[PDB]
Structure 1
Amino acid sequence: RMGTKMMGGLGFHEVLNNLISRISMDHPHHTLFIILALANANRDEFLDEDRTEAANRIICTIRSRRPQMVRSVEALCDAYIILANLDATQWKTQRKGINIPADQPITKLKNLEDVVVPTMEIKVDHTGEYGNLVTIQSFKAEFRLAGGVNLPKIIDCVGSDGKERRQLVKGRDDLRQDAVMQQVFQMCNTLLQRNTETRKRKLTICTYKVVPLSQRSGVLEWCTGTVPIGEFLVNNEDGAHKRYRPNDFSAFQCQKKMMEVQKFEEKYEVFMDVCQNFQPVFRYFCMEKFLDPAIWFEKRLAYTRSVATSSIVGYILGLGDRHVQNILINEQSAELVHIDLGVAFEQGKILPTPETVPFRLTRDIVDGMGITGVEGVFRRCCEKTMEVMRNSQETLLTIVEVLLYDPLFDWTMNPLKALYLQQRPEDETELDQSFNKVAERVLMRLQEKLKGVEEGTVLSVGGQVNLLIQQAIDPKNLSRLFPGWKA
């Protein structure tokens, strides 16, 4: 908002610059990671003017009092930009394997030694006092690569106390949304934590810090011991769906759906024929890692409650297009984390091949619940966590209205953004006032989603969670889904 009008009126910009000053005065670690997102938003080596002027003013006001560490973080972020730009496909596309080869021209991020401020790893909020407990002590460059979406880069940082943490640098990927709307998850976590009834159990949504660098670039956190189920369950060399059941196939499951998408009338028949011979094997994910039954039960109940809370969080905050690669399960805590978040809140019902299921719940997930399924714990946890925001309806809606009135918004359906993330499965198969109108429309949609339904009835927590879980397990609608959604 400060980047919108820095020269307007008489006192507006003045009070805005006076209010954005005390934050940089008291918590510089919270603001130096967000000022760079607009100070280096157009850095290309080898409207926006007002944003650049505001960035220059903020830098000039910060450097006047703050010590010489102001440009150290700028150089550190330029190092990440160089990491995200210099990467080439002729070097680390088929050279991943198992070794971790470093990169020569980077050379310890242009030979850095230590930073006075901590990195994106972790930070505990203060209550009025300054804190410099955790900082950067050293750094090592190994250039790990585990992924194939768009040449992902994985690096490691060793700050104070000597702890190795993995970071993810993305290239040609818009991570601005993954940084502005991801904080809504921790907001809802704090909302459910304030409630005393919702504190007997955890049902917490795990969050991860994300700092954006520029357009089509971003840096997110990678927790140690997190492997996505897309490469752990459905895979040719390592996956419980194939290495355990040799009778059935794994690859032709996608081909059968690609041969059906070409047609519509036989969609339900093809889905039934594919599901009658294929059962879920995701339930064997917990006992293969914890032999002790107590910890096994703890992990399975934590996973069930985590997915039950994430389903409702996704339903209330949109975030459609939940493929098998985005959902990330943790090994030491058994919690599902959304890492991609490619599309906006309300975009699945308007894109080609529209999404029907409002969240991610397949046969693998419904079998991971155990022996009772959804009726036992899933639906009860859902109806318990759905009423935590009905008592505070006038609070959770205030975040969307303030995150949608930003100038850098990219949630509307663009002719290129709605197809650049869907043309890859197609290639694998083939071997303005309108913005404000849509904003008000989706605001009314999210207002009618909770404590009500589009049918006009009340549909309280006793029936809303049942409707949500019935919109998930329905083969007639799953046959109308995208082929790349479920293998």
Structure 2
Amino acid sequence: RICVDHPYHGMYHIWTGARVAVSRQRATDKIAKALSKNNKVSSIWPAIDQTSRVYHALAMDRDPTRYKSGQKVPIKNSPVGQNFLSTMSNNPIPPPTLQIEVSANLDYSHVPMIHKFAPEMAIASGVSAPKILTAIGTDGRKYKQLVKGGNDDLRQDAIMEQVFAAVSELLKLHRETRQRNLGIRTYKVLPLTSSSGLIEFVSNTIPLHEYLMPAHERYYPKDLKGSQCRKEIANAQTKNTETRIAVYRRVTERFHPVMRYFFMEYFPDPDEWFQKRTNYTRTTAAISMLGHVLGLGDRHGHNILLDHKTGEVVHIDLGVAFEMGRVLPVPELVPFRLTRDIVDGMGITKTEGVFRRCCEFTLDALREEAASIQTILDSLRHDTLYQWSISPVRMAKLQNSEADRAIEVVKKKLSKTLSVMATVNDLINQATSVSNLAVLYSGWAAYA
């Protein structure tokens, strides 16, 4: 009944389930067969069927010659590309990465369908080339998409995105966090199979590392390069903590932060500049507290996007949660990312100010909703497919009862024993400490 009333919310789950695992597959197949038989959803299920088939085919198709990392290839030269374009022309659906709100009136006609595709598609660097499609919709907007193929697990990322969205929705019920619009920015992950998915390409952002590495040499031409700092920190990775900390101090004495310019060069108007810098500080505070409480890890520069229209950061790739990050070979022993550049984007008042007061309001509203957070994680506990440990596949892809332990740690981070002021002071002390930042992995660019 859910898939019949709200098809764009249940039919992709049914498709993924069809196309104790054998019994689940059989039951989902029976539901799919029944879906392609009734009158309400009969021009919608075949569309999603054929479209998902061609999206998956396009995802799995990797050719090192036909797809060169960094190029921009017109999607008409591979047979997969032409079959994809034709099938998408014959079957109109809403863009699979568009976030559709649930309709109480059960009317999904106001949803933009895919009108056409832009002729070309970009390519990113990797082995299984992730391709960035663009789709021009009926209402004339551009929906970009990452068609991600390979051996990744996007169901982790999708589940955690849903959990983070639910907790941020809890934040709206309290006066202090609602007055400041404290919350997180969401994106849409859609796993097609156990090896492919569609990720929403966030509209007008730029990765934090891709701004910071050119800016560091544009504003300080006498400093070290980003690559020289990374290599110098990675060479002293098998040495005693004293030498690692000495090398880290030596590197960061020749590397100065430049983040404060991101706002002086995208927003030259002082009114707009002030508002956007405040948006950045508030969204950083909210996601720092929310990712401490849920153990969120893997917070390097390529998982943080800077929205250069509203100023506010977006965190993607949220799958390494519940402290799975301090189990890695070179553990991530910081509660959140607060390096010198994240803190430089905040101005004269480095921390004391908007960032600390917003950390305290967030953490104070979170430990007054510990029952609802317990309910959300409990619903997570009855999910047979969610893995509570990081499988050595991804653990090798990252650095070159488990439910009960995780939920207990989350439950003791929300304990009212210490005051909020003292808790936040301790967190900001251990997130900015040089002895903690010096022993982090070199791909986690802490010098930056």
- From 34, 41, 54, the equivalent of 1:61 is 34
- From 11, 25, 48, the equivalent of 2:4 is 25
Deviation at 1:337, TM superposition (A): 1.4
Is the 2:224–2:254 Cα contact (8 Å) retained in structure 1? no
Deviation at 1:143, TM superposition (A): 4.5
Deviation at 1:128, TM superposition (A): 3.6
Deviation at 1:92, TM superposition (A): 2.4
Residue 260 in structure 1 maps to residue 242 in structure 2: no
Tell me the alpha carbon deviations over residues 95-149 of structure 1, each in whole angstroms, 9 at most, x when there is no partner: x34x453242222533433645423323222224323111325221544325324
Secondary structure of the residue aligned to 2:393 is coil
- From 207, 211, 222, the equivalent of 1:232 is 211
- Could you tell me which runs of 5 or more consecutive residues in structure 1 were left unpaired when the two chains were aligned: 1-20, 41-46, 424-436, 453-457
Is the 2:67–2:73 Cα contact (8 Å) retained in structure 1? no
- From 462, 466, 474, the equivalent of 2:433 is 474
Q: Which residue of 2 aligns with 1:44?
A: none
Deviation at 1:270, TM superposition (A): 1.2
Q: Map 1:53-452; keep pairs closer than 5 Å.
A: 53-65=26-38, 66-94=41-69, 96-97=70-71, 99-104=72-77, 105=79, 106-107=81-82, 108-113=84-89, 115=91, 117-119=93-95, 120-145=97-122, 147-150=124-127, 151-172=129-150, 173-234=152-213, 239-250=214-225, 251-264=227-240, 265-423=242-400, 437-451=401-415
Deviation at 1:246, TM superposition (A): 0.8
Whichever residue aligns with residue 441 of structure 2, its letter is F
Is the 1:176–1:218 Cα contact (8 Å) retained in structure 2? no
Secondary structure of the residue aligned to 2:144 is strand
**Residues in 2 aligned to 1:188 and 1:342: alpha-carbon distance in whole angstroms:** 16
Greater mean deviation of Cα atoms: 375-384 or 152-161: 152-161
**Residues in 1 aligned to 2:247 and 2:253: alpha-carbon distance in whole angstroms:** 10
Query: RMSD of aligned C-alpha atoms?
Result: 1.8
Q: Residues 393, 474 of structure 1: CA spacing in aligned structure 2 closer, same or farther, 3 A cutoff? A: same
Tell me the alpha carbon deviations over residues 259-298 of structure 1, each in whole angstroms, 9 at most, x when there is no partner: 1103223111111111222221111100101111000111
Greater mean deviation of Cα atoms: 101-110 or 198-207: 101-110
Whichever residue aligns with residue 258 of structure 1, its letter is A
Is the 2:370–2:411 Cα contact (8 Å) retained in structure 1? no
Is the 1:328–1:338 Cα contact (8 Å) retained in structure 2? yes
Is the 1:193–1:199 Cα contact (8 Å) retained in structure 2? yes
Q: Among the aligned pairs, what percent are the same residue?
A: 40
**Residues in 2 aligned to 1:178 and 1:71: alpha-carbon distance in whole angstroms:** 27
Is the 1:115–1:136 Cα contact (8 Å) retained in structure 2? no
**Residues in 2 aligned to 1:134 and 1:154: alpha-carbon distance in whole angstroms:** 22
Deviation at 1:299, TM superposition (A): 0.6
Tell me the alpha carbon deviations over residues 320-358 of structure 1, each in whole angstroms, 9 at most, x when there is no partner: 121111111111112211222352322112221111112
Give the TM-score normalised by structure 1: 0.85
**Residues in 1 aligned to 2:420 and 2:305: alpha-carbon distance in whole angstroms:** 28
- Could you tell me which runs of 5 or more consecutive residues in structure 2 were left unpaired when the two chains were aligned: none
Is the 2:60–2:196 Cα contact (8 Å) retained in structure 1? no
Q: Count residues with an aligned counterpart.
A: 436
Secondary structure of the residue aligned to 1:64 is coil
Q: Residues 134, 115 of structure 1: CA spacing in aligned structure 2 closer, same or farther, 3 A cutoff? A: farther
Q: Which residue of 2 aligns with 1:36?
A: 15
**Residues in 2 aligned to 1:129 and 1:405: alpha-carbon distance in whole angstroms:** 29
**Residues in 1 aligned to 2:305 and 2:22: alpha-carbon distance in whole angstroms:** 39
